[PDB]
């Protein structure tokens, strides 16, 4: 069915980000002490990780295909806000963001967004 199909595509796409070079840094939520960034949650008010998105997909918390995109984009927007441009972490965020946006086209995922937008 319609929602089962884009759930399945979203699961495939999120797994491909996890396996992308450097993707491990987005897999779990940042540990502010362990990653030596004690102010992280003072700057990032809406934290997000690949594992959060995987849990939402597993539990059925998404109603619309755009909700998945919004959460993944939030990962990269948090990355670019906290980290200085040209840092190893910022570079990695931009790499995976570009990969992600291409995958949305290549996989057809954007077609589910287009259809769901018409349904309102």
Residues that bind ligand A1IUW (CB under 6 A): 24-26, 30, 35, 37, 40, 79, 82-83, 89
> Could you tell me the smallest distance in angstroms from the CB atom of residue 117 to ligand A1IUW?
30
Cβ nearer to ligand A1IUW, comparing 9 with 96: 96
> Could you tell me the smallest distance in angstroms from the CB atom of residue 113 to ligand A1IUW?
25
Torsion angle, alpha carbons of 36, 37, 41, 45, to 10 = -130
> Could you tell me the smallest distance in angstroms from the CB atom of residue 9 to ligand A1IUW?
24
Cβ nearer to ligand A1IUW, comparing 83 with 107: 83
Q: What is the DSSP letter of 48?
A: -
Which string of DSSP letters, residue by residue, matches 54-108?
Answer: HHHHHHT--SSHHHHHHHHHHHHHHHHHHSPTTSHHHHHHHHHHHHHHHHHHHTS
């Amino acid at each position: 069915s319609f929602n089962k199909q884009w759930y399945l595509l979203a699961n495939q796409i999120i797994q491909s980000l996890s396996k992308y070079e450097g993707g491990h840094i987005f897999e779990k939520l940042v540990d502010a002490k362990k990653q030596n960034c004690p102010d992280y949650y003072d700057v990032i008010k809406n934290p997000m990780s690949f594992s959060c998105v995987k849990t939402k997909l597993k539990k059925g918390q998404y109603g619309l295909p755009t909700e998945f995109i919004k959460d993944v984009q939030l990962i990269f927007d948090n990355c670019s806000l906290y980290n200085t441009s040209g840092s190893l972490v910022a570079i990695t965020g931009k790499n995976i963001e570009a990969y992600f946006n291409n995958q949305l086209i290549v996989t057809g995922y954007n077609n589910f967004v287009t259809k769901a937008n018409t349904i309102n």
